[PDB]
Design a protein around this nucleic acid. Structure first.
Ligand SMILES: [Mg+2]
Ligand SMILES: [Mg+2]
Lengths: 113, 118, 195, 86, 101, 132, 133
RNA sequence: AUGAGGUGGCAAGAAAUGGGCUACAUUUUCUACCCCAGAAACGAUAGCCCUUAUGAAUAAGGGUCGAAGGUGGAUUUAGC
């Protein structure tokens, strides 16, 4: 593989030559990818690791370690609501919020009132 | 019942290849690399050689400044991260015979290899 | 010391490939442009500035490239690549019959290095319930559930989606929401039977 | 009415928001976790690119000797004059 | 090389607010919630009180970037009125006309 | 009496160009904007960043091509690609001209992580609009 | 005299899956110069004609925002200076438009933008019903 | 150090004056509508208490208080 790459870069250095056309300059810009991707989806890249809409919105599975009626359940339900409403932050941010809240009230388990 | 045209897939460069093949070479015009105004217009082979060599020397100067002060251009302001634009790193790490050996083939020189063999 | 050669005006012929000498967008380059076009506020007993030092022609947007000849060339070139629309689709009613579920997204494009902008995420969709529900109980149930997403004058139910940053997330979440909404309007409850 | 209350409950269950009733001090939580804080918003995080980078680059490039900085020439010329005149 | 020490302080405040923006919002919600215990509200209050200074986004100021003028600055352009007028007169920026209506 | 982007009337021995001769209330009426972007329009953003970056661009290029320019620049930003247009004099060598052209273009591209291009128009002596 | 013999043509592949059907491509151009907008829309309509699709034109009104500033520096409240940002709209709608036609047309136009213009696409595509319903 | 950094308060009124707002009425006040009606024969954007808005720590709203005020000192301001 290595010597194949050396020979390939040699062949390239033999290939490349001074261009003649602004279209060729654009072809070069698009070869390195600096020129934008028409059609502009505004999302070419930043895929969020193939995350899922239900993974974002439905936090029912992330909410398992508390009953259905308590005030902690109330607060965490409203938290999941606001998080699903927020598109700006991803599943990683939502789960770190949730786990920080978990640590918070698990260290403050002294009350449970 | 229903007729539907089939989908096709193109390369990002293929469209511009078509656009370029559409148009022929410019007639009675110097290469695009050279400027358009008449004063800067290179009007001889030796001077044109020297001109684009000065341009290449400026390119090498740019490489030198970027690889001498990477922290200035370290900011990835552009949304698409591009290693072609990122600063270049030929910096040996701390003494580590195994990682140093793995970095040998990355640094592309001979003094590191002499020291590693030592 | 050095002296510049005269411009390309007298060099360029009357018969000339303007699309070839100006393939892409570029500045005015009066040295290459043979036209004496001038632009500038003339002085009393005076005239506008000559094309050479007229930097305002550069200030203004530029359209010397892409002549009508160039447009004809490129359109009759790309004619081979463009496809044909189905002739069976000939009217709005027939298109919405063939494919009732309308969906539309949108986004801006602006000058600058960055390209992302959150407005890319929003999408909306529409469907007329006159032909889709095929029943009356579920229709009354659904129209009672939805508060303002409908409009009976034009008779189309419309719903938006922005809760997700990704366009495809918005899309498939809207699809799944419509599916679950239909499946939940299918059934009923005792408090709904008692009204 | 109870019918409309349960309609709202179902609509909330479907569209994400809370079905159970809740006060404004609690919907505070919802809208806060919906809208990001100004402290983290880009409008605050990026108020301007760093004069650190700008001035350091321009100073290093002057030391290279390419950017004839008129203001700096003025400043250091008058500095020379002041240190000559005491 | 910021303009001056007050700009330096403002940027330090901005850094602190950015790097504490998460926990501040979290505990502010945990405070302003009502159904939860008032003792919890008070614990969160004293926690916010013990939080360090220059960490709030209230102490920062939308100051000018060029001349560090706090007043007379547009949130959109972020420039002082004087530098704005300077650039608008010199025609540096784009697409702005004098309102001679 | 207002003093804003205008030249004081002298005895008639001051060559002045179009843009600096005309007033700043003639911008849309008898001038063009030096830059062209959409941040000023509605719906866009980053306009402050656009202004800062183009001011720094103009300053840096004025000072890395010092003594040759004789007028303000023309900026043309079509989506991603940035285009610069300058008018300069022909006293120095094309060697230096091309060297600094490549140098500045590479630096701008590496800094802004954006495709940049720049063109220059030669003049023997700066065009004068009037003698004021 | 120099006319090339073999013009290099791109490679094309017709994938098995069907192309998407856009109901309406409604593009909205915001600009500062009515003449530039007229030239741009003339360009667009001529391209659409040469490609063989339907067209329509209409000009939404001009939107302006103005705000007042202090003319002087230190103490002058009566004497102010004013400014205005003018945006001019133009709409172009194209109906019964195939997916690949949309691709080629938007590539062409997006490469042929001018500088001082913003371009807002609204894409309307019809589709059949899901399977779970 | 007349530079820099971090805690605090400072920013009140025996008083005179300036610009604006409120009303001193029945062309007024309240009620639904913004104009075919019915009642009253007014006035607190000050003070006390409370709620809410954001903030880590002034503003709007509610109850009470229900006066000065009775249409202007020469003189003076703006308006085709
Ligand atoms: Mg005046
Ligand atoms: Mg507060």
């Amino acid at each position: 593989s290595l010597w194949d790459v050396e020979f390939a870069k040699q062949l390239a250095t033999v290939n490349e030559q001074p261009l003649q056309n602004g279209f060729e300059e654009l072809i070069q810009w698009t070869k390195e990818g600096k020129l934008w991707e028409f059609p502009i989806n505004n999302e070419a890249g930043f895929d969020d690791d193939g995350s899922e809409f239900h993974e974002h919105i439905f936090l029912e599975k992330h909410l398992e370690s508390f009953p259905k009626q308590g005030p902690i359940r109330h607060f965490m339900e409203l938290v999941t609501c606001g998080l699903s409403k927020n598109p700006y932050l991803s599943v990683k941010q939502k789960v770190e919020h949730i786990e920080w809240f978990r640590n918070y009230f698990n260290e403050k388990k002294d009350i449970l009132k | 019942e229903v007729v539907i045209p089939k989908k096709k897939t193109w390369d990002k460069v293929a469209v511009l290849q078509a656009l370029a093949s559409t148009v022929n070479r410019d007639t009675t015009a110097v290469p695009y690399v050279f400027q358009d105004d008449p004063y800067l217009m290179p009007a001889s082979s030796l001077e044109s050689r020297s001109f684009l060599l000065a341009k290449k020397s400026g390119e090498n100067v740019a490489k030198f400044i970027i690889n001498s002060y990477p922290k200035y251009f370290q900011k990835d302001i552009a949304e698409p991260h591009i290693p072609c634009l990122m600063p270049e790193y030929f910096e040996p790490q701390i003494k580590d015979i195994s990682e140093a050996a793995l970095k040998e083939r990355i640094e592309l020189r001979k003094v590191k290899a002499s020291v590693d063999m030592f | 010391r050095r002296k510049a050669l005269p411009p390309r005006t007298e060099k360029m012929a009357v018969d000339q490939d303007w699309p070839s000498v100006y393939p892409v967008a570029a500045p005015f380059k009066p040295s290459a442009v043979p036209l004496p076009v001038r632009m500038g506020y003339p002085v009393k007993k005076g005239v506008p500035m000559a094309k050479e030092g007229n930097l305002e022609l550069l200030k203004i947007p530029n359209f010397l490239h892409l002549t009508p000849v160039a447009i004809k060339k490129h359109c009759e070139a790309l004619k081979d690549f463009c496809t044909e629309w189905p002739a069976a689709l000939d009217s709005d009613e027939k298109c919405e019959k063939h494919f009732p579920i309308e969906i539309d997204s949108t986004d801006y494009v602006s000058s600058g290095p960055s390209v992302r902008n959150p407005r890319a995420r929003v999408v909306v969709l529409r469907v007329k319930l006159s032909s889709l529900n095929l029943d009356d109980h579920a229709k009354k149930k659904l129209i009672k559930l939805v508060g303002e997403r409908y409009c009976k004058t034009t008779d189309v139910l419309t719903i938006k989606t922005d809760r997700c940053p990704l366009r495809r997330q918005n899309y498939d979440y809207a699809v799944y929401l419509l599916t679950v909404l239909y499946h939940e309007s299918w059934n009923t409850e005792e408090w709904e039977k008692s009204k | 009415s109870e019918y409309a209350f349960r309609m709202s409950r179902l609509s909330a269950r479907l569209f994400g928001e809370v079905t159970r009733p809740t006060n404004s001090k609690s919907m505070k939580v919802v809208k806060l976790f919906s809208e990001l804080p100004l402290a983290k918003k880009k409008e605050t995080y990026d108020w301007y690119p760093n004069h650190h980078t700008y001035a350091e680059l321009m100073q290093t490039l002057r030391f290279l000797g390419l950017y004839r900085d008129e203001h700096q020439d003025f400043m250091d010329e008058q500095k020379r004059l002041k240190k000559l005149r005491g | 090389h910021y303009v001056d020490w007050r700009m330096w302080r403002d940027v330090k405040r901005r850094k602190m607010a950015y790097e504490y923006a998460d926990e501040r919002l979290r505990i502010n919600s945990l405070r302003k919630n009502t159904i939860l215990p008032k003792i919890l509200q008070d614990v969160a209050d004293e926690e916010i009180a013990a939080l360090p200074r220059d960490s709030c986004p209230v102490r920062i100021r939308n100051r000018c970037v060029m001349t560090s003028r706090p007043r007379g600055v547009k949130r959109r352009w972020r420039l002082s009125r004087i530098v704005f007028r300077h650039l608008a007169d010199h025609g540096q920026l784009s697409g702005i006309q004098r309102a001679t209506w | 009496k207002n003093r804003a982007a205008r030249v004081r009337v002298s005895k008639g021995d001051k060559p002045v160009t179009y843009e600096e001769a005309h007033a700043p209330h003639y911008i849309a009426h008898r001038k063009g904007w030096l830059s062209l972007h959409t941040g000023n329009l509605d719906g866009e953003d980053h306009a402050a960043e656009r202004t800062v970056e183009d001011v720094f661009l103009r300053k840096f290029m004025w000072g890395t091509f010092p003594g040759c320019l004789a007028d303000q620049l023309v900026l043309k930003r079509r989506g991603n690609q940035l285009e610069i247009c300058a008018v300069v004099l022909r006293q120095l060598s094309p060697h230096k001209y091309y060297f600094l052209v490549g140098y500045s273009e590479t630096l701008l591209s590496y800094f802004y992580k954006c495709p940049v291009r720049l063109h220059l128009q030669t003049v023997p002596s700066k065009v004068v609009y009037k003698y004021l | 005299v120099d006319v090339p013999k073999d013009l290099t043509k791109p490679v094309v592949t017709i994938s098995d899956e069907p192309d998407i059907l856009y109901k309406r491509l409604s593009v909205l151009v915001k600009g500062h110069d009515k003449a530039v907008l007229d030239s741009y829309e003339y360009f667009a309509v001529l391209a659409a004609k040469e490609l063989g699709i339907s067209i329509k034109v209409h000009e939404p009104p001009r939107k302006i925002e103005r705000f007042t500033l202090l003319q002087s520096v230190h103490i002058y409240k009566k004497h102010r200076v004013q400014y205005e940002m003018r945006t001019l709209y133009r709409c172009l709608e194209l109906e019964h438009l195939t997916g690949s036609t949309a691709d080629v047309y938007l590539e062409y136009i997006q490469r042929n933008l001018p500088e001082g213009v913003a371009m807002e696409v609204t894409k309307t595509q019809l589709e059949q019903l899901p399977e779970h319903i």
